[PDB]
């Protein structure tokens, strides 16, 4: 899949969470960066970034396993253009 290339001089217009993904009952995890929301009319929305996307790469650099604020910093220091590689399973959540 090609990277999403966003053109912003402002915020990109999305939010993300760092999810601590555990594999068992020990305090051991791989940090995963997941887009939680995208703002209407924003550069991120326009480019096709979607809530639920796992961001694997920022400007060609693997970000899987980096802590939240390291990824926030990469986003803050990027320019008007950013390239995001992402992957998603279901295109919606399920309400229960």
From Swiss-Prot:
This chain belongs to the protein called: Microtubule-associated serine/threonine-protein kinase 3
Domain of life assignment: Eukaryota
| Domain PDZ, residue spans | 3-90
Q: How does it assemble?
A: Interacts with PTEN.
User: Where is the protein found, in the record's own terms?
Assistant: Cytoplasm
Question: Would you identify the family this protein belongs to, as annotated?
Answer: Belongs to the protein kinase superfamily. AGC Ser/Thr protein kinase family.
Q: Which disease is it linked to?
A: Developmental and epileptic encephalopathy 108: A form of epileptic encephalopathy, a heterogeneous group of early-onset epilepsies characterized by refractory seizures, neurodevelopmental impairment, and poor prognosis. Development is normal prior to seizure onset, after which cognitive and motor delays become apparent. DEE108 is an autosomal dominant form characterized by the onset of multiple types of seizures in the first 2 years of life.
